[PDB]
Ligand binder design. Sequence first.
Ligand SMILES: COc1ccc(NC(C)=O)cc1
Ligand SMILES: [Cl-]
Ligand code: NA
Lengths: 301, 301
Amino acid sequence: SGFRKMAFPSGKVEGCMVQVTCGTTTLNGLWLDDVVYCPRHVICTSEDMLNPNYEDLLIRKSNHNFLVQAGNVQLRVIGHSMQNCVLKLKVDTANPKTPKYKFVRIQPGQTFSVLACYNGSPSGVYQCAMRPNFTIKGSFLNGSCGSVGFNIDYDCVSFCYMHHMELPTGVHAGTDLEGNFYGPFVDRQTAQAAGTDTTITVNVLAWLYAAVINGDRWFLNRFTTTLNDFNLVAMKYNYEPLTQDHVDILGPLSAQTGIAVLDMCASLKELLQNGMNGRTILGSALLEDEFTPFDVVRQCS
Amino acid sequence: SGFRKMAFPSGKVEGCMVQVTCGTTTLNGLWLDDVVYCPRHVICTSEDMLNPNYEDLLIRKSNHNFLVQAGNVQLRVIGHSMQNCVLKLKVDTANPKTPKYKFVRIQPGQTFSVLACYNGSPSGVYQCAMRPNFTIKGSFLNGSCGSVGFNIDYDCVSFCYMHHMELPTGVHAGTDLEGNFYGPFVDRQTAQAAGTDTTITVNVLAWLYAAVINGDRWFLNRFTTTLNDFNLVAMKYNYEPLTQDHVDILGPLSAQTGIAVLDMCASLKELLQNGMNGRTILGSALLEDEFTPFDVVRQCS
Ligand SMILES: COc1ccc(NC(C)=O)cc1
Ligand SMILES: [Cl-]
Ligand code: NA
């Protein structure tokens, strides 16, 4: 038993991380087979921050302008192209530590592990969720661009995030590994701000199911709710709408615990109204929304 | 910026994990050089676990009684001995993936990364503190025994923990890699309880500094205090005593923020008295005590 924010073992990703330098800018890249993926903003200088014309900046680059380093080894770049907001440096060596992998774009609410990296060297691993406003609440300092997010279901590494930038509110924005931003953001230093964030209701519910699995029952009640009444209440606390999809997804946890989804919704409505009254759930005094239904089942009995 | 509970990258340890089977029990082992380390209780049947005589049960065993599997490869066990509550299985092959490592014993209040494993296969990684009561608040299911905890210093893995058991309250107990328990526990199926735990004061303070560094500043104030006055409040709230050594260790963070420790203690005092019923610091409505000064500095530098 116990319940923790648990990251995937990072080794398979660690063997892919390299340092990319262009001009005076160094950041991280992801070396898979004979390609290194990194943020295209590596090719920007000081006066290319606001309105970079990436197609124009890149045509002016030769292969030798990019210094790629895997530990001590210099990798030799033999080709470059851009795909959306990701730069793809072709190298002369295929990475012998390339794992089984895929690229997947995730939806708000999904969780993944982040391997924070500086100068091509992994620093730490932690779990994030894609927030409803398409940001993530990470821990990123200067030099962390090109750090990636991933899952590892069944020995295959699914890459879903590459870190590009920190927005003014101290939250983080990035792309999938096809270079498409999550959310309305752009890789320019023009003023940008995240939308108002909301709580990931389906995840909070899954976490309440975790709590019950782990032997907590204090927050349950004898009430139920219609789905609609639930949404009308929860939205007043900036919770995301709960959809029939979400209800379907919780069916297994419902079944294992014997607590119908809408009954659990009733408990959540009450927790929102009352707070915790000095109590905690799974070691938190807040309602946690960064565990998916799938994370709960993975981690629990 | 941002502040997240972060594990060490786990790859150096993942390469060391194997499966160990003795009779009907399978659990995890740590393969370093030509030895596999696992809990001695692997040699126990359920009957045995009530009152085990390990000396006796072990002489009755032979090398072939232990099946050790690294991935899809059987290792040949060529020797077996016990050190305290750890079994040492000598095998015919040195682990080619052995990292630079040492075995260390950590102190209460210190943190480490746990690589949770099942059937020799790494499953997840998360950070834990060794509690004052010598338990850890982990996340472990049956099969997780022999999972290890570690820190990384430069390229040296310091192994400090091996998982042995869950206590009735849902908290976890284990040994160092030399088989010495953390805490007053024994490796037998008997009645055992964690002592009442206390809050790690210096870590709470470290985390208040992290909060300040990330622009969470509301809880600050003009006041200061003394060690003596504060400690009398700490005792009252089941906080560990704050020592001069703790104040010194927080020196960097006092410097960085302009808030002196006793200055921060004044803040913490008010928080213990006055509370935070539902209000938040770094996204928590609890006073978090599982980040050390080093954790805060390392993450925030
Ligand atoms: C299957 O038989 C056993 C024997 C021993 C344990 N555990 C401890 C701590 O003695 C568990 C199961
Ligand atoms: Cl998704
Ligand atoms: Na103060």
